């Protein structure tokens, strides 16, 4: 038969694998999408998927009656150290429904008002650290952003202080996480994954796993020393039952959820803050306008929940940064039944289809011709944006459970940053997106001149 | 009645050296003083000195008309990396008078009121660090005190942020300083100092010196980026003239003073704070009384200058810690002319005599029979203390120029510590005084339970 979809160059038994022989496979796939079109087939030894890049097809892919969430190989390999976490379970397994019903109350607006204080604590830590630098000292943006987001997720969801700011080096948990992610990404490119030559790598992987487990233990132990304090994730994990089955999460599942949320609740958020600061220093008029909104809204020494909710331009800037470079850049789906996507591409039952979020966010037929320009004003009227054209947090019931958490924290931190400092791109930094499955700017450095605004104690 | 001076066992060409083959030489000399008496002679290859331990002889040694400050071998070896600092120059030389007249205004009571804000800044940093610990986490006392004192001396005297709290490891300057000081202390005890086996050590020494110089440069550079701000010691060093000779300090002398003050204004102070906290956790009733006085006086979120000056019991505790274990434990003097010490020991022109401060502070004929007891109340009436019986900061013109600085900083920090926390000796720590020329407790760890008292803000301009 005649195929209906384009497909890039195959290399024999290696299929399309040699096309991802880079450190930036997501950007390589973005280039392939630029070449072939909205949808194209991609074959690797043992698996076949179809990459979607246009709103026309993705709005049908998000129809939960026709497609459901699939665990692409990256997630299946993350399961080795995250277990059956909330993000690594099929939508139809008991683990997902149980954990979802148990953990969803932890992200209500009341829990947001609760986490606000600790978020402000870590934000104050970051601002003070930047204030206490000497002259002619720069800021390693990604590093301090990871410090802040890790401390925040820890303190807010587990009442545990990582104290990343009291370390001149990255936290060991962060380093082990990055090593594990790099190992997963490399394992995805191995023709013969059971080759003995990879044994060394595998061994190192286990060491990283050890680190993770150790941290979990301490967190659990620390709880037993303090007790139930905030209505955090840990309280609901330990003392929480399913309103349907009446069962609480077992101990192994609790450990899995702990590692999963620790990893998820800080890496992508770090990427978001770094990208936002990059675009702000690269568009001076937007920088000035957001600084004006920050100085206008944030009037108290410490910002309040309502003040963060009134930072509309900060939210628009964050959403535009999410648009241009979604930190979690893709998600996979499978067809529940045979269907015809877009009325032009037939799909069988169980076929794999992956959404290339940056190319969806660059669909000119929906966004315009200025897709590559950082213009947050395009989020002025939220209803003017067509359906399913902006999907940085997933879709449907399997969407990011901490979307409100992440947006609130990032808004607060960026507001305080632009209130208390004025930033300078002292190097003319050329963007370089490093990939550990997720995207993050590497080498981004700026200088900050304090606006000398007092930061009191509350 | 001319007596013959005692002397411990001699070992041939090594003289009394084999008695000091320890890492705690000051404590060994204290034991020798307990055995032999008020005065005893001590010979090392190439040098001879006489150790004094009684108020009767030390009050004559502090007679500036008969004796002047001598640079003992420890200071001559410190000069290798501190240069001709204020503490390392003879009293009669032009360098000391010039540098003294230039730098003395930096320690007036007005300059203290100025430094108070930055002191409170670093103190808030320390308290915040301790509040943010998890349960079942102990406190490395000496490490955090060194953090605080280094950050404070930097911020106050050079407007430079070391940010010792943003490092889980000791600052590299502190590590190089401790290694150089241990090298001086060990070099003073080496039978064969030119033996090839020690060559490596010497090499390491030089590397440390590099570090020092590098830091100095940064400080200078940082000033040129900011300008004359807090009118610190650096302002007086660079833009300061002698009210007598009209000369400003040259550049090499400025670097020497920078390194000298950076080391002096924090090492001994770290030791003082560590010792005081030790004595407080080992005498719970004194701890409670000082905590109560702290809660009475410090009522604002951040303490003020007057509030620090109203903490008399904290000052008495600091002074008792200074008495029992003076962080700088000795100083040397030489006889201007031939004289008769105590009416019993003849001294020639230029003979060396060193004051053993801990034994002076343990002279029962002046302090009582409880010299070994931690009783700060003995500093209630300051006029009740006899003359020349308490010399933790030196004597005469060559006394500690930053004594007010050290006492104010230590009082403020200890007051805030005892206001915001309750301490627990969770290990029943057995005292161990580590010596790198200075004295400081090593291995001291405690736990802190917060009283959950709020802390205020600071502008940080
Ligand atoms: C800018 C920041 C973030 C971005 C772009 C992002 C993106 C995403 C995406 C695309 C998914 C869906 C993956 C899929 O369907 O295969 C997802 C799910 C998820 N996110 Fe995030 N996320 C962010 C921050 C966070 C934070 C702060 C948390 C904190 C708890 C979090 C926790 C989760 C979890 C647990 C899931 C899986 C939930 C489920 O499937 O039931 N994420 N996120
Ligand atoms: C508990 C803390 C301290 C103790 C026990 C202490 C002890 C001493 C002693 C015993 C001397 C006399 C040395 C001798 O006569 O050979 C001295 C001198 C000196 N100290 Fe301190 N000190 C302390 C803190 C400080 C501080 C905070 C500074 C800040 C600058 C400082 C700087 C100096 C200087 C420059 C001299 C030499 C002054 C001169 O000779 O004109 N010290 N100190």
From Swiss-Prot, chain A:
Mutation effect (residue 264 to M): No effective fatty acid oxidation. No effect on electron transport from NADPH to FMN. Slightly lower high-spin conversion with arachidonate, palmitoleate, palmitate, myristate and laurate/dodecanoate
Amino acids binding heme: 400
Effect noted on mutating residue 264 to C: No effective fatty acid oxidation. No effect on electron transport from NADPH to FMN
Main location: cytoplasm
Protein's UniProt name: Bifunctional cytochrome P450/NADPH--P450 reductase
UniProt source species: Priestia megaterium (strain ATCC 14581 / DSM 32 / CCUG 1817 / JCM 2506 / NBRC 15308 / NCIMB 9376 / NCTC 10342 / NRRL B-14308 / VKM B-512 / Ford 19)
Family named by the database record: In the N-terminal section; belongs to the cytochrome P450 family.
Uses, biotech or industry: This protein is a target of protein engineering. Its selectivity-directing and activity-enhancing mutations have been extensively studied and the designed mutations allow this enzyme to act on non-native substrates and/or in order to enhance production of synthetically desirable end-products.
Subcellular location per the Swiss-Prot or TrEMBL entry: Cytoplasm
Induction: By pentobarbital. Expression is negatively regulated by repressor bm3R1 at the transcriptional level.
Residues annotated to bind (9Z)-hexadecenoate: 51
Primary gene name: cyp102A1
Consequence when changing residue 330 to P: Enhanced activity with small non-natural substrates with altered product profiles compared to wild-type
GO CC terms: cytosol
Region described as Cytochrome P450: 1-458
Full protein: residues contained: 2 to 459 of 1049
UniProt-annotated site: Important for catalytic activity, residues: 268
Keywords: Cytoplasm, Electron transport, FAD, Flavoprotein, FMN, Heme, Iron, Metal-binding, Monooxygenase, Multifunctional enzyme, NADP, Oxidoreductase, Transport
Recorded consequence of changing residue 47 to Q/S: 2-3-fold decrease in binding affinity for N-myristoyl-L-methionine as substrate
Result, substituting residue 268 to A: Contrary to wild-type, significant decrease in the formation of the high-spin complex via substrate binding, and decreased substrate-induced reduction potential shift with saturating concentrations of arachidonate
Top-rank taxon, per record: Bacteria
């Amino acid at each position: 038969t005649i195929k209906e979809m384009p497909q890039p160059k195959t290399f024999g038994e290696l299929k399309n694998l040699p096309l991802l022989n880079t450190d930036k496979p997501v950007q390589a796939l973005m280039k392939i999408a630029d070449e072939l079109g909205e949808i194209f087939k991609f074959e690797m030894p043992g698996r076949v998927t179809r990459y979607l890049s246009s709103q026309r097809l993705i709005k049908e892919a998000c129809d939960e009656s026709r497609f459901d969430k699939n665990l692409h190989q990256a997630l299946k390999e993350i399961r080795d150290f995250c277990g059956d976490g909330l993000a690594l379970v099929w939508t139809h397994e008991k683990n997902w429904k149980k954990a979802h019903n148990i953990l969803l109350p932890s992200f209500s607006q009341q829990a947001m008002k609760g986490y606000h204080a600790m978020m402000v604590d870590i934000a104050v830590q970051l601002v003070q650290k930047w204030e206490r630098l000497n002259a002619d000292e720069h800021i390693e943006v990604a590093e301090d952003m990871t410090r802040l987001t890790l401390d925040t997720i820890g303190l807010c969801g587990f009442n545990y202080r990582f104290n990343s700011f009291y370390r001149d080096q990255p936290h060991p948990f962060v380093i082990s996480m990055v090593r594990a992610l790099d190992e997963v990404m490399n394992k995805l490119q191995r023709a013969n994954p059971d080759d003995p030559a990879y044994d060394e790598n595998k061994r190192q992987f286990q060491e990283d796993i050890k680190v993770f487990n150790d941290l979990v233990d301490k967190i659990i132990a620390d709880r037993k020393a303090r007790g139930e304090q905030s209505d955090c994730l840990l309280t609901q994990m330990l003392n929480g039952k399913d309103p349907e089955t009446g069962e609480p999460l077992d101990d192994g599942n609790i450990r899995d959820q702990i590692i999963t949320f620790l990893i998820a609740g800080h890496e992508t958020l770090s990427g978001l803050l770094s990208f936002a600061l990059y675009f702000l220093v690269k568009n001076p008029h937007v920088l000035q306008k957001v600084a004006e909104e920050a100085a206008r809204v944030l009037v108290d020494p410490v910002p309040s929940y309502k003040q963060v909710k009134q930072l509309k331009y900060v939210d628009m800037v964050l959403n535009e940064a999410l648009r241009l470079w979604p930190m979690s850049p893709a998600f996979s789906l499978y067809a529940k039944e045979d269907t015809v996507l877009g009325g032009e591409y037939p799909l069988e039952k169980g076929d794999e289809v992956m959404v290339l979020i940056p190319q969806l966010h660059r669909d000119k037929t929906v966004w315009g011709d200025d897709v590559e320009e950082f213009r947050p004003e395009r989020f002025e009227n939220p209803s003017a944006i067509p359906q399913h054209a902006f999907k940085p947090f997933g879709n449907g019931q399997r969407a990011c459970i901490g979307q409100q958490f992440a947006l609130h924290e990032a808004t607060l931190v960026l507001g305080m940053m632009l209130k208390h400092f004025d930033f300078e791109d002292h190097t003319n930094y050329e963007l370089d997106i490093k990939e550990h499955l997720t995207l993050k700017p590497e080498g981004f450095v700026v200088k900050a001149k304090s606006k000398k605004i007092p930061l009191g104690g509350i």
